[PDB]
Design a protein around this ligand. Structure first.
Ligand code: A1BN5
Ligand code: ZN
Length: 139
């Protein structure tokens, strides 16, 4: 689990969105596993505006943060796992690292701010849905 709070927006994994998220929907993309809902409280996170390919992410299944190198956002085929099916997903970045389903929502951050959130995993890789291209989250 986990979310990004920037301005009056909440960014969450689309597959983890609640009834309140869908009732206050701002934007969603089923090809990216992202959904953004509106909030009454003002959030203070900052979204990175950059092309970094190194950062740190939080892994709840290890209660640890790990430094990683990651690929630029692209269209990737995600392999089938014990509990979830295989799929194609866009704007996804991969790194070598540990990820289990419940790790979705963990934030990847660089020196500039939030880069993305854990969205895929298995086979020794971790995949993050990028948010740096969503410029409208800044206004
Ligand atoms: C994160 C992870 C790690 C290991 C194994 C599997 C996963 N995948 C998920 O929990 C997951 C569940 N629902 C949807 C998606 C998606 N990106 O569409 C991903
Ligand atoms: Zn950066």
């Amino acid at each position: 689990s986990g979310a990004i709070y920037v301005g009056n927006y909440r960014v969450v994994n689309r597959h983890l969105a609640t009834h309140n998220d869908w009732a206050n929907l701002v934007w969603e993309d089923s090809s990216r596993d992202l959904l953004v809902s509106s909030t009454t409280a003002q959030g203070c996170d900052t979204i990175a505006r950059c092309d970094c390919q190194t950062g740190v992410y939080y892994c709840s299944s290890r209660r640890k943060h790990y430094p990683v190198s990651f690929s630029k956002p692209s269209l990737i085929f995600v392999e089938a796992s014990e509990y979830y099916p295989a799929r194609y997903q866009s704007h996804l970045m991969l790194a070598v690292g540990h990820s289990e389903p419940g790790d979705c929502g963990g934030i990847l951050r660089c020196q500039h701010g939030v880069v993305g959130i854990v969205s895929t995993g298995g086979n020794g890789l971790v995949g993050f849905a990028d948010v740096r291209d969503l410029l409208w989250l800044d206004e």
